Subunit: 248 residues, 4 copies
């Protein structure tokens, strides 16, 4: 049995790191994937060549732009006929700079990409699900437990993650109350082994993970398979943490 047979999924930030692991798990389970990225178009070439252009498609996308969402939706439908799943995975990370010295622009950019872009994606995926999937679908909002090492001191990153969490709740409820079978859940990765970091951090990172190591990207992929499939038809407005016990 292929757990995502004929499902069509949009995965933002989908050609590198965590998003790529989600794409790999999805393709493995029989799904068609549209993977997107703002700048990494060669990442898109590589993914499509890996998966095959019959089951995968790359689209360039800046998730902060309302216009690129319509562009991805149209490209997804044009290629695959429908939209069943949105994985909002694209996000920018946390920095350790003093809060009183943070420029508005740097704050606003994080809010745009980590929070507002989730809203925009939801809105776009919901319309396309009502239009092509009999108002049925699953939306997954991905946000790391910690996006900076040690204390979550990045006010922008933390704020946008907190925003994303409640967005998920409110959206699942906003839909449910009008009888629309579109589930919205959040996934919360701890520390995944993708980007290399200085050893005075990497060792300091692992020191914060009870199980003594980092996750792989497919760890996050596996939970997304669950949430994307009808195995999770009664999971809604909920938070799914895969963090090696980081915030236990």
């Amino acid at each position: 049995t292929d757990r995502l047979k004929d499902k069509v999924a949009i995965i933002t930030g989908g050609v590198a790191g965590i998003g790529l692991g989600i794409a790999e798990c999805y393709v493995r389970e029989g799904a068609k994937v549209v993977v997107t990225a703002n700048h990494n178009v060669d990442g898109g070439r590589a993914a499509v060549a890996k998966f095959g252009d019959d089951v995968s498609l790359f689209v360039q996308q800046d998730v902060s732009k309302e216009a690129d969402w319509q562009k991805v939706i149209d490209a997804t439908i044009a290629k695959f006929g429908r939209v069943d799943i949105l994985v909002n995975n694209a996000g920018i990370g946390g920095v350790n700079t003093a809060i009183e010295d943070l420029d508005l622009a740097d704050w606003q950019k994080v809010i745009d990409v980590n929070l507002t872009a989730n809203f925009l994606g939801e809105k776009a995926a919901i319309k396309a699900m009502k239009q092509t999937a009999d108002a049925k679908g699953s939306i997954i909002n991905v946000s790391s437990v910690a996006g900076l090492v040690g204390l979550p001191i990045d006010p922008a990153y933390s704020a946008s993650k907190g925003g994303s969490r409640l967005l998920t709740h409110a959206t699942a409820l906003n839909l449910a109350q009008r009888g629309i079978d579109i589930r919205v859940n959040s996934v919360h990765p701890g520390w995944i082994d993708t980007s290399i970091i200085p050893e005075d951090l990497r060792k300091q990172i692992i020191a914060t993970i009870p199980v003594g190591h980092m996750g792989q990207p497919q760890d996050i992929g596996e939970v997304c398979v669950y949430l994307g499939s009808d195995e999770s038809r009664f999971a809604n407005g909920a938070e799914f943490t895969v963090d090696g016990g980081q915030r236990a």
Copy 2:
């Protein structure tokens, strides 16, 4: 499939309702199951007849009794050679009344069966896992939405479920700190339709569920497959809520 190939699972209260659902999903994925019940001996025979002698075993068990835990471990190792997964699913409602009118004995029964029994089981499962499974395994405490938010009609229940949720955190961390690869996680079902009730009560229950219908036992089963299998190797000390939006 076989997402649980050659895993041996103990499932307490596994012969009816949610527990039977978990057992059905487990058997589907190639697991061997030991299902237990305190009173429902005939439900247990029925389960083994439906699954088969070769992959299932019924052991009568009062989860509150320390000796019954040793009994199930003994029977499990004698039958299947090892213990890979414990699902603490057995539980009891509690006396619906005014808090200050609750008898200590009624309070204590609920604590005994919903909380202390979980600890007894973790302990028994951990020893069996170190001895027969190279100190690898997965423990799932089936708690309740009532361990996340207060249940007005039954505070002993709420208390016991909030306790087993935190027990889950501590146990996972206690194991992880010492390098032991036994994961502990909690599952929080909302309303699952498992019994006949008055239509008045059913309406009241459904009003509290945003999606407007109770879940089914296999909804819980599915998340338990994910948690019991190696797919969730980086999920630890975490809470998995399947409640159709109830506490969103």
Copy 3:
């Protein structure tokens, strides 16, 4: 009395509802209060008139505008020579629409006023405290219950209060890590009786409050007196909920 003796506080949204309640408690306890509004000079005059001219000062303020924070700060130091306390109480609801039909401009306006404004105020206040109070002080982010559980009718409000909440945690830790004695906490009001409202809506709001009645504005002020004074010197990065049991 005199629990806030010789303290100077800026209270945004300070001339009506919750904020006026906070100001009333603050004045009562010996504080100098700079209350602000964006479009309520009439409100700001009655407050100033009733508090006196020497204990209260009114300033027009758009909390979303970075320039107005400077203006308010400057005028507070002009009048009272220091800043000890900031109460981020200004906030707005949004459209009560279906999520897929919410215009980005409506989303953005809620995020600007409820979330980004809080960050702007924090920057402003931290700078003023560093120089005019020996880097000691208290910031109180007035979020809401909507920042703890989802508000179906307003996903942007939920997202923003969820954001305010984590912003609080992050800001408190950012300052503490640098040995700066500026505390940041959030307060989460449930339903407080401010507007006049129709009986039907009243009855159905009161239906969701376990204690059977809305709170008063001074209920929020009492918890803010505590958070503003040195009685709470060890209260940091925490959440303070006064909601008549609404999210219990």
Copy 4:
């Protein structure tokens, strides 16, 4: 102008450390106090002598004992005529024992004292408030953020802390549904400097506190003053954390 004027409060574990801090704040604010202790009878007599026996009383009490609860209630009414506040402060800290090595008797002891005792106290206090204070009162369930220095690894401590959290919510709700104005809330102390400890232990402890220092007993007493008075009449089923940002 005294904030707990004429109030009668029972405070378990109220003769040393944190409990004594709560007692000090309470007497300062005009309350009459009954402080209790299991073994520390000398401390009990000291406290009453310090406060004066016209405003205080000491009763020996094992909070796990149903009968001792009646004893305390009986003595309180005998001496002060009524019961307005209960502070459940008695409690055992945690240990670093391996989960699978923990004896049932050791587990049970902590459950009895840190969870079941809160239930027994709530039960006794509510009856007394109904009978002598017109079904008005305030109940405070105190449980510290950490029971151990490092990771929360003590299963019994964590489980009882989890259960008390939920007992607090459910009890508040159980009462509110019957129109009974007894509020139940929890208070969560961080590390409080109460005893002589070795400097390496102090170092490890402070390492986990973001503000870089322990609190003082009266930090806990101040928040308890707020909760015990009518300043917090709309505060119910809620958790108040005073921890220097320890779990922020």
